[PDB]
Design a binder for these strands. Structure first.
Lengths: 634, 630
RNA sequence: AAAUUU
RNA sequence: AAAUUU
RNA sequence: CAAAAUUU
RNA sequence: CAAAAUUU
């Protein structure tokens, strides 16, 4: 058919980036802007052998920890077995035949695989063998162990909690929001649920037993209308009795970076709820998160949920922290993201910083906090939108139940329930906000105690005791270590050596200006490199190494000498065709230069990454524009 | 990745339209809005067999005509052999190695292949065998014959022409344009050339010897800047001598619907020019075609290039035609599209209509007309954009050369040239405009002669002689038969039985309103159906698309043709109707929708074959759920 | 598709 | 991608 | 990957 | 399928 020459050129370029052999031929003589790198310490085969050795030792340790016996699940209420859902949508049951079914009973099987790399081979190629070996034997990305899973589940379900003193007024002070940014919940429900964002490959939960992508029509067309009709009729107890799997959850073992020494003691449990329930509550949660302010925007906010290190965020944290005041006389600067807190106070005019963490904070989350957070979010919406008060208040009751008393399967047909309402069931929508509020309520009380003159609470022993006795929260060991802050750090200097949100804060130099950037020691970047959170062709594996190397540089590895070198070596080792191939993005052929990453963390206007091959576009299109004037004199 | 549920539903729908087995399952109980159709006259096996039989006979006749010896090509100038282009673009020669090369010399091979069906099988399945057989044996889509190709080439190249008397003023009256709709040619050349439209699978010609899609970078990056530099240095003669293939064309046989009786005498020739030269001139031609007005827009216009039968166009022709005046005293209504012309005169106050066609009109196109059209177009641009006058005047000279004296290859290495400047080399950019203008100049002069009282020219013998002697144009036999017009036709009545642009005009009834629509007898529609101008899934989709297209062209206004096309659409499996296609096209042309298209109604989508298809493919139908309930 | 974080 | 036209 | 925040 | 016009 007839097409413009521009359109033909565009189509050709798209097709050309999908032809690897063509890309190889076109870029075979192209100039490459190579990243700064560190040299090879050993050959390909030596690196592969050292990797194979460490991988064999790790697989032995993981297999041994997975063989460890687990304690009984008698700490949980036993609710029996549930029949498989018989709801039919069109030609198929919502619960697929032959799946999650033992004699008409819903069943699950916990997977604890022995695991098993390209990244480890690259580390041995460019780094000291002893350091790489010690780093890779210390931490591994694994499904964990039955023993660690049950142990952590016991702690999360059996912790004695302290009911917080919380009002909507306190929550407005600690967690301010913009009411105009809240979505209109008085709108039609179908449109609202369609607006929620989700992980397409995540499990839709019972009764779908498939990805949210595959189960979306069964949710929207069949189950969600059923649920709505029972909500508006106050007949949800009938729905639960007739269809229990509609309100069933799955306790799952989290695949995570786990310390090899503690694999038998710690495997984190999470709960996978039904899609219909999650989607309804996500209308309220995703709207509220959009309206939520952060501490840098409001001095009263204890909220770091939403904070970005980029676009001046790192410097914003320092500006916010310096406005901290003398303990007992003026307010401290406290910001919380779940279990992670940044605390700033002044003693004799000198700024000090504490970066404490809590242990299994979800078990400590009391039911009063959960109900109050739900009331705060629901009330925020019904104030701005009063026409839909009753429906969303009923959704709030479903939210509290999913967060505290949802029945759940672990392995097999037995359904269990937490004996106590206290304890957040991690995985419910709002998990991070519930944890953030609990932390902020405790730290707000701690600051009130300092204004009352209890300055001994700045000290570790008293602080640990305060959070346990008054708030049921256990301070992680080593996390209460007050440190003098370098308030105006010179070039190449750290604010403190402590980490907030997993990263240290450092000042770097651009001309004579100071740019605040995230930083970590080399060992920390090396741990992340060797332990990919990977869920296949050689090409995709080569692209994955390039993408991971670029990601770690943008996260701050560009500010560590050895990490910048390793990631540069991986990027430079990537074939030209793999760098310039068509890829799924948010063609990504740029690289993170030191200057680009400095610009990202600065308040500079956004810019594209410098190109690895500056002539790639012209070479792939086989055409470079030459200006040809029609106004010449002939 | 993190995505909205709305976006996930949109992704799912697109993917499902590409899963034909899933489409089959989800549409297995769907209600189908079946098109009106005529019944099966015979079974699949019998229809396939009768098709095979007619096909065997037709192949034999085509092979016999293809075997006929051809006459000599000595009527043309012989320019020797041209060396293969040695220009290199990076790692590859612009002229590919191993292609179009005989001992270093540019070569081509004409293809005259025999043979060419699903459509004929459908016709035998739903129509009388005798009519279908007669129809299929009369016309075939073929590459033609060597004998017919050379005969037509001789006619096109050796015809005595008459130089028209033309001015920019006559051309402004007969072909008015909107100057502001002209593209700014004062702009940078690369941008202007990237703005042009082209057939991606058409030949880029010498020296690329590949599709325009494959040759586009070699043209833009290597040849176009070489050509530009020589244009501004007046050194094009040097470029031609060093690189002659840059200015070489290929004379090719046109694959077309041809009468089997005349295959040995008639195979149409066309010229395939270099992409670089074509693209440069296409800047001017495509811009001018955008600005051109039609007879319905300007009463002075004799131009039907740009006319649409749709959106009231058919009725616009009737309104325009009735404005005709008495022969001898007031202006007739004349519109021309290449060789095709619609003429309306009033004799004794009664509207009359002539629809004549010229024969091998391109040979009759004189050099003065070609030069004048080029000058008219170049001048239009340089008047609105004067800073670029010199460049486009040089491009104008290349345009006239391509239209008249381009060296060309036919078969093998011999390069040829038309001995006379006269004669249009069909295939040059502007071919249809050159033909339209020549026709219009001749008919403007015929009208001037009528106003002089030579009203005898309304008669066949007189008109034929006038066009041959005064304009070098040969009126096709039968095309001069004036006819009384039904100025306001009744429901189901033709304006005339004559064909303009291949179609009759007819009034149909919608409510009590009249809708003017195109029309043809069933035998014409069946000829088009059995002679298509061309995986089982692709073949089934093609039948559905061809049936829909013919209904939209007017087959819906013929009882038997509507029935046959409806039978083909109804026979198409649901998955093939609803599958993702290059333009989701799951609609069908109802009689009412086609009446709407030809009316001045606001555009609407075709009625769906499966109205619940979208909801079934998505497996979801929206149910309103109010959050403001108690 | 990828990085970090809880 | 498909229809008609020159 | 259960919910998520930030980023490319 | 050489240039094209109209249409889906």
């Amino acid at each position: 058919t007839r097409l413009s020459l521009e359109a033909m050129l565009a189509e050709r370029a798209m097709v050309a980036r999908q032809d690897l052999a063509g890309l190889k031929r076109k870029l075979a003589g192209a100039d490459r802007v190579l990243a700064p790198q560190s040299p090879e310490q050993c050959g390909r085969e030596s690196a592969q052998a050292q990797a194979r050795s460490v991988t064999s030792e790790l697989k032995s340790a993981v297999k041994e920890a997975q063989g460890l016996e687990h304690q009984t699940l008698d700490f949980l209420e036993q609710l029996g077995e549930y029949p498989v859902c018989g709801i039919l949508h069109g030609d198929h049951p919502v619960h697929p035949s032959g799946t999650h079914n033992n004699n008409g009973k819903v069943s699950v099987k916990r997977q604890f695989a022995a695991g098993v790399s390209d990244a480890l081979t690259c580390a041995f190629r460019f780094e000291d063998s002893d350091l790489v070996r010690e780093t890779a034997l210390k931490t591994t990305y694994t499904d964990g162990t039955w023993a660690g899973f049950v142990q952590r589940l016991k702690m999360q379900t059996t912790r004695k909690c302290v009911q917080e003193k919380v009002s909507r007024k306190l929550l407005k002070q600690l967690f301010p929001y913009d009411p105009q940014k809240l979505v209109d919940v008085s709108g039609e429900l179908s449109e609202l649920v369609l607006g929620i964002k989700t992980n397409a490959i995540a499990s839709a939960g019972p009764p779908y037993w498939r990805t949210k992508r595959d189960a979306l029509p069964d949710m929207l067309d069949c189950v969600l209308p059923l649920l709505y009709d029972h909500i508006v009729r106050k007949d949800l107890t009938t729905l639960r009795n007739k269809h229990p799997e509609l309100f069933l959850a799955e306790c799952k073992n989290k695949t995570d970076r786990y310390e090899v020494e503690s694999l038998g003691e710690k495997t984190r449990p999470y709960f996978s709820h039904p899609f219909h329930l999650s989607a309804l509550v996500s209308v309220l949660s995703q709207s509220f998160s959009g309206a939520l302010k952060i501490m840098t925007e409001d001095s009263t906010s204890f909220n770091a949920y939403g904070f970005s290190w980029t676009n001046g965020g790192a410097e914003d944290l320092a500006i916010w922290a310096r406005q901290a005041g003398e303990a007992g006389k003026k307010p401290p600067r406290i910001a919380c993201y779940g279990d992670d807190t940044d605390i700033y106070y002044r003693k004799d005019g000198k700024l000090y910083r504490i970066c404490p963490d809590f242990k299994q904070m979800d078990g400590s989350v009391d039911a009063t906090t959960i109900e109050a957070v739900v009331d705060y979010v629901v009330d925020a919406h019904v104030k701005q939108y009063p026409t839909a008060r009753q429906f969303w208040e009923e959704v709030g009751k479903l939210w509290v139940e999913m967060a505290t008393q949802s029945p759940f399967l672990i392995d097999g047909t037995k359904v269990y329930r937490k004996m106590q309402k206290d304890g957040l069931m991690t995985g419910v929508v709002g998990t991070t906000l519930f944890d953030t509020v609990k932390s902020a309520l405790a730290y707000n009380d701690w600051a009130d105690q300092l204004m009352f003159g209890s300055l001994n609470l700045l000290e570790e022993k008293y602080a640990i005791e305060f959070f346990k006795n008054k708030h049921g929260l256990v301070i992680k060991e080593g996390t209460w270590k007050p440190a003098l802050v370098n308030e105006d750090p010179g070039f190449g200097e750290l604010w403190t050596e402590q980490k907030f949100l997993g990263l240290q804060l450092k000042v770097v130099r651009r001309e004579n200006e100071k740019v605040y950037v995230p930083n970590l020691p080399f060992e920390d970047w090396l741990t992340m490199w060797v332990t990919p959170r990977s869920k296949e062709t050689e090409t995709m594996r080569e692209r994955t190494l390039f993408d991971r190397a670029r990601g770690l540089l943008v996260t701050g590895a560009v500010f560590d000498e050895r990490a910048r070198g390793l990631m540069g070596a991986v990027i430079n080792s990537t074939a030209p065709e793999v760098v310039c191939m068509r890829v799924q993005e948010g063609i990504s052929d740029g690289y993170p230069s030191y200057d680009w990453v400095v610009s990202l963390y600065s308040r500079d206007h956004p810019c594209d990454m410098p190109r690895v091959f500056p002539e790639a576009a012209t070479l792939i299109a086989s055409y470079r524009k030459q200006v040809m004037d029609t106004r010449v004199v002939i």
